[PDB]
Symmetry: C3
Amino acid sequence: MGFETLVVTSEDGITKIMFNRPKKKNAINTEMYHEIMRALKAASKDDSIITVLTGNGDYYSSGNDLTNFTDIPPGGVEEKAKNNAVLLREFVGCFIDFPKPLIAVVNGPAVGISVTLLGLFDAVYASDRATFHTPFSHLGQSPEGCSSYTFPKIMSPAKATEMLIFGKKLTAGEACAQGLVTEVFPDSTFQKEVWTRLKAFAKLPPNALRISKEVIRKREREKLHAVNAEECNVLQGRWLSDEC
Amino acid sequence: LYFQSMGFETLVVTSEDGITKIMFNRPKKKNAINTEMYHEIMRALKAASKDDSIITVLTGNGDYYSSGNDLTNFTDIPPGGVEEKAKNNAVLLREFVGCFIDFPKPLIAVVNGPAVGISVTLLGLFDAVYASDRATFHTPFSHLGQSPEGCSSYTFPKIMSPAKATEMLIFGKKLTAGEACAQGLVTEVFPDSTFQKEVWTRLKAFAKLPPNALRISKEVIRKREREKLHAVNAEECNVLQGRWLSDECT
Amino acid sequence: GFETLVVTSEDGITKIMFNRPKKKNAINTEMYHEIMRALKAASKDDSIITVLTGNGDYYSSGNDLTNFTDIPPGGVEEKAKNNAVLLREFVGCFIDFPKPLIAVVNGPAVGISVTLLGLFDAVYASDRATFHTPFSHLGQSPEGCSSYTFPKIMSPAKATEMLIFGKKLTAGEACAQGLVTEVFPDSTFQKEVWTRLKAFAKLPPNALRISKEVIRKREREKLHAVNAEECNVLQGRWLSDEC
Ligand SMILES: [Cl-]
Ligand SMILES: [Cl-]
Ligand SMILES: [Cl-]
């Protein structure tokens, strides 16, 4: 351990996974996908009670890196699409499957896939200078991260559409109101308050946390995986299109 | 098919800026939906579904969004009596709701004033709902001895939480625009004086987005769910047929 | 004829009142049985509307701690299996109740008495009511269908702070998060709720019952399956080191 694009630390029964490309506003590139997956696969097995994701610097994440498309393979755009789809599908699935309580500490602006995944977390704490933006249809794409299913359930289809289809950008307050964020904190004391709270959580009976989440999450996974898959076919097609 | 605007008796249907605008137009009768308007609304959507607008809006003329079903749809009695009137109204309603379940473009309600009954329950099928601060929402079904429809027995609990949906479908609490926005039914409320302006500016923008992206995105959200909604619709209609032949309705 | 409840019927409203105010209305083995018999009764009688409420200062403190300590001939193995069967059957009554069901939350609520709220048709609370499900704190898993209903009602984000991390909600929070229908100031709480309920009871009776039926029926089979699953996982949690 061992990471180029992340900083993975483990203290107090809390594994903290920190995006670490602050220069590029924590954009998620092909390597970071793989690293995130390995970090979660690792934290799912270790003996931490609780797993956090957060961003280094001013951004939570700007979502997918624009350079994941431009690197072109031997089978042309046909194969790059199919390869990205496979990777994405697998990537989302790790979140669907993660067995321990998973928490997002949103430290600043979030975009794209980093936002859509938030529907799979167990809690989401945000600073009052975080924002949430999924401008999919602006860039000719469809939703992913299961968001086509989770976001209507969480926000109401009325509010979900303004965001997935019309690309409205939410403030932390709005996102909290619309169910996406668990709580907002003023920026100055953001880091302190979350961590105090997380530390307490990590002191709760460990199998109880793991089993409780199991009961809430299990019955629902098969559906999510099927949504993931469907989302990915539609996304593969969207990438080979004139509008993208 | 049609060129810029379509000939209807109870509606005004126009197409401008990749937006198809369907307006209820019986402002004298608070835009009450009568048998003819049902048919026209279906033909209007069928049209908007096939033309080359990006976005479809539903709105009311005058002060009301709609008062819901027209009371005069019951009194016009056929040769088979109330038995057949009920069966016919149940068939029409089922088919009518179905159009909304199946509509493939983004569908938006511009609620310019008080909405009632079917005009409210159908809101659970829309993609956005923008309301003026003097819009209200009211579904007093059980008060007139009836059961819910528009898929609202499924969508309203999902959207509002069963706790809040019941005060509305079962106990006929009327909501203000702000309440309805808070409870998930309305996307956004606007002050009346600037309501029309604001909504249309925003809509014009939306219409400028990549057309196939909007259509495909909606499809991904909406498709896996239709089969269930059609089932709910069907079930709501049988239960409603029954309710119309009962003592509590008269 | 009830030991732990007070069941009355007036104005087409059946009122079921928890009545162990000395013990903060804790639900013991007997009260489970009585609540079931009371509902089974109210389901068949000619009331339009059924209310649950608490005597005294508490709505309910949830399960009584003395339901575990009374030990049977088959040891902890059988106690667990019996409690699981009872609980499953008990929750089922709420899943199945056919008339409109309303909780008048007069004060603090805990545990099973909170989780069941996801099954009610309305929930009116006094501004001094609170809602707390500290399951994982006592090494247990959720029940009352709450592992399914609470994410649907509150959003998984907010449901988790409650079922997994045991955050205690105030009535205002609970109302905001979708759990409670409306909050009333304590001084006029009783008055206001009953006025409203008396009105509701004057609505066309079959319309109420049929409307509820249309909202609720398609959804029961799932809830029963959730209830069952929740109970097996709970049985296991009782035979564990963390409990
Ligand atoms: Cl990718
Ligand atoms: Cl009709
Ligand atoms: Cl028990």
